[PDB]
Amino acid sequence: SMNPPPPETSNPNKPKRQTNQLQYLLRVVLKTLWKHQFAWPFQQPVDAVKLNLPDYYKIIKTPMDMGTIKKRLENNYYWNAQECIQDFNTMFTNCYIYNKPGDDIVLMAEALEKLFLQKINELPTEE
Ligand SMILES: CCNC(=O)C[C@@H]1N=C(c2ccc(Cl)cc2)c2cc(OC)ccc2-n2c(C)nnc21
């Protein structure tokens, strides 16, 4: 069994910013989800080898996780908040696409997504 390379978290060619919205995405949004009891399956890329999911990366072609998002935020990988918000939404969508309705993992994603939406609802205006 083989995992793909992880998503990119570093690229000197990619233009970067440190904005108040991106700071909020780290300090409020990422931190709130990371500390949650249901955070652990989402704190690193899906390990298809260890989890015995040989079809995971056959079905999921745009992998994303909070480990990657955390690295992207801490290393100022993004230009804007929209990029980061998309990463969170890709993470949730992947979970819903791969898994069955009512699965424990789907309920975990839903609880995290509820908090995500609550926090992004009060994304600050750009300074
Ligand atoms: C048929 C079995 N299905 C799975 O294992 C899917 C897997 N399901 C889980 C998972 C996590 C928690 C529970 Cl209670 C049940 C399943 C999961 C657990 C992990 O442990 C390190 C990593 C990624 C996960 N994950 C994510 C994220 N999206 N799908 C899955």
Swiss-Prot record:
All residue ranges annotated as the Bromo domain in the record: 17-123
Entry comment on modification after translation: Phosphorylation by CK2 disrupt the intramolecular binding between the bromo domain 2 and the NPS region and promotes binding between the NPS and the BID regions, leading to activate the protein and promote binding to acetylated histones. In absence of phosphorylation, BRD4 does not localize to p53/TP53 target gene promoters, phosphorylation promoting recruitment to p53/TP53 target promoters.
Protein location: Nucleus; Chromosome
Site (Acetylated histone binding): N99
Tissue specificity statement from the Swiss-Prot or TrEMBL entry: Ubiquitously expressed.
Cross-link (Glycyl lysine isopeptide (Lys-Gly) (interchain with G-Cter in SUMO2)): K58
Domain free text: The NET domain mediates interaction with a number of chromatin proteins involved in transcription regulation (NSD3, JMJD6, CHD4, GLTSCR1 and ATAD5).
Note: JQ1, a thieno-triazolo-1,4-diazepine derivative, and I-BET, a benzodiazepine derivative, have been tested on tumors with success. Treatment with GSK1210151A (I-BET151, a I-BET derivative) has strong effets on mixed lineage leukemia and promotes myeloid differentiation and leukemia stem-cell depletion.
Family the entry assigns: Belongs to the BET family.
Disease: Cornelia de Lange syndrome 6: A form of Cornelia de Lange syndrome, a clinically heterogeneous developmental disorder associated with malformations affecting multiple systems. It is characterized by facial dysmorphisms, abnormal hands and feet, growth delay, cognitive retardation, hirsutism, gastroesophageal dysfunction and cardiac, ophthalmologic and genitourinary anomalies. CDLS6 inheritance is autosomal dominant.
Subunit record text: Interacts with p53/TP53; the interaction is direct. Interacts (via CTD region) with CDK9 and CCNT1, acting as an associated component of P-TEFb complex. Interacts with RELA (when acetylated at 'Lys-310'). Interacts (via NET domain) with NSD3, CHD4, BICRA and ATAD5. The interaction with BICRA bridges BRD4 to the GBAF complex. Interacts (via NET domain) with JMJD6 (via JmjC and N-terminal domains); the interaction is stronger in presence of ssRNA and recruits JMJD6 on distal enhancers. Interacts with NSD3. Interacts with NIPBL.
Function description: Chromatin reader protein that recognizes and binds acetylated histones and plays a key role in transmission of epigenetic memory across cell divisions and transcription regulation. Remains associated with acetylated chromatin throughout the entire cell cycle and provides epigenetic memory for postmitotic G1 gene transcription by preserving acetylated chromatin status and maintaining high-order chromatin structure. During interphase, plays a key role in regulating the transcription of signal-inducible genes by associating with the P-TEFb complex and recruiting it to promoters.
Protein name: Bromodomain-containing protein 4
Organism: Homo sapiens
Residues of the full protein shown: 44 to 168 of 1362
